[PDB]
């Protein structure tokens, strides 16, 4: 999250020299990014899907040899 670090750096550099106060802009941008962005459950689901796809491919290839 480079935005929070950049906001903290700007607030620390502009503590005494408050020429351009972008604290509100940074907070609004952070809130908007958090609203727009939206555990290992996804990884487990992906592993299960990969295993199921491998099983389906194996089952499809099991019916390759067929004479009559």
């Amino acid at each position: 999250f480079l935005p929070l670090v950049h906001n903290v750096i700007k607030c620390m550099d502009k503590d005494s020299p408050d020429l351009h106060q972008d604290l509100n802009a940074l907070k609004t941008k952070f809130q908007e990014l958090r609203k727009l962005i939206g555990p290992e459950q996804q990884q487990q689901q992906l592993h299960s899907l990969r295993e199921q796809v491998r099983t389906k491919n194996e089952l499809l290839q099991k019916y390759k040899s067929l004479c009559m």
């Binding site: 999250f1 929070l4 903290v8 940074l26 952070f30 199921q52 796809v53």
Partner: protein, 94 residues
């Protein structure tokens, strides 16, 4: 899963930044936000990979279902023919 955790971490970081506080709470919030961003990136990559794998598996399953339907129709025709032949044989056997 990762979406809700990343959103909660970003909300906590924004609430901490809305307000120093011993230079500890801000650093902890920044670290939590960075970890949440990394986890969200990893989760997006995993979701893209899972969507690709799901599309591939759906294509394979559609092909298998078409093959199974064709085989079922062929076996049904063959079974009807064999039943007719068996009836004719039982009739002609006497």
């Amino acid at each position: 899963l990762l979406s809700a955790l990343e959103d909660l971490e970003v909300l906590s970081r924004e609430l901490i930044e809305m307000l120093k506080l011993l230079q500890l709470e801000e650093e902890n919030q920044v670290l939590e936000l960075l970890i949440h961003r990394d986890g969200d990136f990893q989760e997006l990559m995993k979701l893209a990979l899972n969507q690709g794998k799901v599309h591939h598996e759906m294509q394979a399953l559609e092909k298998e279902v078409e093959k199974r339907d064709s085989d079922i129709q062929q076996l049904q025709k063959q079974l009807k023919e064999a039943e007719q032949i068996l009836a004719t044989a039982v009739y002609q056997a006497k």
